[PDB]
Design a protein around this motif. Structure first.
Motif, mmCIF file in Angstrom:
data_model
loop_
_atom_site.group_PDB
_atom_site.id
_atom_site.type_symbol
_atom_site.label_atom_id
_atom_site.label_comp_id
_atom_site.label_asym_id
_atom_site.label_seq_id
_atom_site.Cartn_x
_atom_site.Cartn_y
_atom_site.Cartn_z
ATOM 1 N N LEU A 290 59.114 71.855 80.444
ATOM 2 C CA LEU A 290 59.019 71.081 79.232
ATOM 3 C C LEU A 290 57.743 71.430 78.490
ATOM 4 C CD1 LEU A 290 60.053 67.712 80.815
ATOM 5 C CD2 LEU A 290 61.495 69.214 79.463
ATOM 6 N N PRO A 291 57.722 71.238 77.171
ATOM 7 C CA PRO A 291 58.883 70.822 76.378
ATOM 8 C C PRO A 291 59.922 71.921 76.312
ATOM 9 C CG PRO A 291 57.000 71.247 74.982
ATOM 10 C CD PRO A 291 56.499 71.320 76.368
ATOM 11 N N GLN B 298 51.708 76.507 77.663
ATOM 12 C CA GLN B 298 51.862 75.271 76.908
ATOM 13 C C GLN B 298 52.765 74.274 77.609
ATOM 14 O OE1 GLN B 298 49.504 75.715 74.602
ATOM 15 N NE2 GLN B 298 49.708 77.898 75.185
ATOM 16 N N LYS B 299 53.298 74.624 78.778
ATOM 17 C CA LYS B 299 54.401 73.906 79.401
ATOM 18 C C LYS B 299 53.936 72.987 80.520
ATOM 19 C CE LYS B 299 57.666 76.028 77.167
ATOM 20 N NZ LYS B 299 58.321 75.381 76.015
ATOM 21 N N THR B 300 54.806 72.029 80.830
ATOM 22 C CA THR B 300 54.692 71.149 81.984
ATOM 23 C C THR B 300 55.971 71.246 82.814
ATOM 24 O OG1 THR B 300 53.279 69.632 80.732
ATOM 25 C CG2 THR B 300 54.304 68.788 82.717
ATOM 26 N N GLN C 185 54.920 65.681 87.702
ATOM 27 C CA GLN C 185 54.726 66.518 86.533
ATOM 28 C C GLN C 185 53.503 67.375 86.768
ATOM 29 O OE1 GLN C 185 54.677 64.434 82.817
ATOM 30 N NE2 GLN C 185 56.711 63.537 83.166
ATOM 31 N N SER D 201 51.171 70.196 84.945
ATOM 32 C CA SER D 201 50.693 71.047 83.878
ATOM 33 C C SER D 201 50.639 72.489 84.372
ATOM 34 C CB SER D 201 49.313 70.565 83.436
ATOM 35 O OG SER D 201 48.696 71.486 82.543
ATOM 36 N N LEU D 202 51.199 73.418 83.587
ATOM 37 C CA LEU D 202 51.174 74.842 83.911
ATOM 38 C C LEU D 202 50.065 75.583 83.176
ATOM 39 C CD1 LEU D 202 55.037 75.489 83.774
ATOM 40 C CD2 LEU D 202 53.603 74.686 85.669
ATOM 41 N N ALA D 203 49.054 74.861 82.697
ATOM 42 C CA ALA D 203 48.071 75.459 81.805
ATOM 43 C C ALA D 203 47.157 76.429 82.532
ATOM 44 C CB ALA D 203 47.248 74.363 81.123
ATOM 45 N N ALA E 180 50.070 73.055 72.955
ATOM 46 C CA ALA E 180 49.890 71.803 73.654
ATOM 47 C C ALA E 180 48.485 71.267 73.416
ATOM 48 C CB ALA E 180 50.125 71.994 75.151
ATOM 49 N N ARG F 149 45.520 69.510 75.154
ATOM 50 C CA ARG F 149 45.037 69.533 76.529
ATOM 51 C C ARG F 149 43.886 68.559 76.729
ATOM 52 N NH1 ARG F 149 45.217 76.077 76.291
ATOM 53 N NH2 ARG F 149 47.341 76.200 77.185
ATOM 54 N N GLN G 251 50.417 63.743 84.013
ATOM 55 C CA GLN G 251 50.512 63.180 85.349
ATOM 56 C C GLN G 251 49.915 64.158 86.346
ATOM 57 O OE1 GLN G 251 54.329 60.464 85.228
ATOM 58 N NE2 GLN G 251 54.144 61.646 87.174
ATOM 59 N N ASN H 291 47.789 70.059 80.421
ATOM 60 C CA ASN H 291 48.620 69.909 79.232
ATOM 61 C C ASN H 291 49.114 68.472 79.103
ATOM 62 O OD1 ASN H 291 48.503 72.585 78.318
ATOM 63 N ND2 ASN H 291 50.267 73.187 79.549
ATOM 64 N N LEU I 22 52.148 66.059 77.597
ATOM 65 C CA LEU I 22 53.509 66.001 77.112
ATOM 66 C C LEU I 22 53.691 64.826 76.175
ATOM 67 C CD1 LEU I 22 56.170 66.576 79.778
ATOM 68 C CD2 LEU I 22 55.872 67.824 77.592
#
Lengths: 129, 129
Positions: free
Chosen positions: A47-48, A85-87, A108, A110-112, B3, B5, B108, B126, B128
Motif C-alpha cells: 500500500l498504497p 513510498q510503500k507500506t 504494517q 514501512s518499506l522506506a 509518502a 515520513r 504502525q 512511511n 499511510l
C-alpha cells in the motif's frame, strides 16, 4: 496470553525491478484464536495500491496451530524509488467454505528503509487487532 | 507525490525499566496536508493499552510545514517483556480552528525487535493515509 507474531523476510531485486516478500511463520497464534479447528491464511497488501499492478496477495489456508509455517513468497514488480513510498500490510485471517476472510489482526511495515541491494532482512512483527 | 515520513528514535532503558520514544520530525508533509494555516500534532499510542500505565501521548501543536521538527520524547514505564508485545501507533493530526482532531495519516511500528540492550534505533517510517 501475549502477542501473536509473524516472521517475514524482505528483499529487493534490482536486476529484475522486483520486491520479494517471504511469509515464513506465525508464533503464539493461540493468543489470537478462541475457536478450534479453524483455517488460517495471511493476506498481504502493498500500500498504497498502485492500479497498474497487483498489490494484494493471500497465502494458502492452513489448519490453525500455535506455531504455523507458511513459507510462501510473493513477488511484486516495482521500482526501488516507488517501493520506498510503500507500506506492507499483513493480516492473519480465518476462513471457511463460505470463503469470507475474518482478518483478526495484522502488522504494517514501512518499506522506506528496504535496502536496494544485499541480503534479505528477516524480522518478527507483532500483530495488533 | 510521495509518502510523508516520520523520523522516530526508540531506546529501551533496562536500568530504569522504561521505554523512550523520540518524535523527531515530519518530512514531505505536503503529501498529506494541502489545507493552509493548519496546526499539526503527533499522536502516539503504545498498544495494546495496559490501562494501569499511560499509553497515549501527544506532541505540542506546531504550524504546518513541509519539513516539521518536534523533538519531543515520551517515556513509558514497562518491563522489556511487556514492551516486546506492543505496537506503536503514530498519527499526524490537525487541530482545526473548530477543535476537530481529525487525523491525516499514520504508521504502525511493531516493537517486537527493540533491543533490551538499549541500542538506540533512529529510522524513517512511511505514513499511510
Amino acid at each position: 496470553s501475549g502477542a501473536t507474531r509473524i516472521q517475514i523476510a524482505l528483499k529487493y531485486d534490482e536486476k529484475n525491478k522486483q520486491f520479494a516478500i517471504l511469509i515464513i511463520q506465525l508464533s503464539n497464534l493461540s493468543a489470537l484464536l478462541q475457536q478450534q479447528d479453524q483455517k488460517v491464511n495471511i493476506r498481504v497488501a502493498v500500500l498504497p495500491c498502485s492500479e497498474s499492478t497487483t498489490c494484494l496477495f493471500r497465502t494458502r489456508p492452513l489448519d490453525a496451530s500455535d506455531t504455523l509455517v507458511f513459507n510462501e513468497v510473493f513477488w511484486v514488480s516495482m521500482s526501488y524509488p516507488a517501493l520506498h513510498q510503500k507500506t506492507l500490510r499483513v493480516d492473519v485471517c480465518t476462513t471457511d467454505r463460505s470463503h469470507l476472510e475474518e482478518c483478526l489482526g495484522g502488522a504494517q511495515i514501512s518499506l522506506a528503509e528496504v535496502a536496494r541491494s544485499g541480503e534479505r532482512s528477516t524480522r518478527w512483527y507483532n500483530l495488533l487487532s
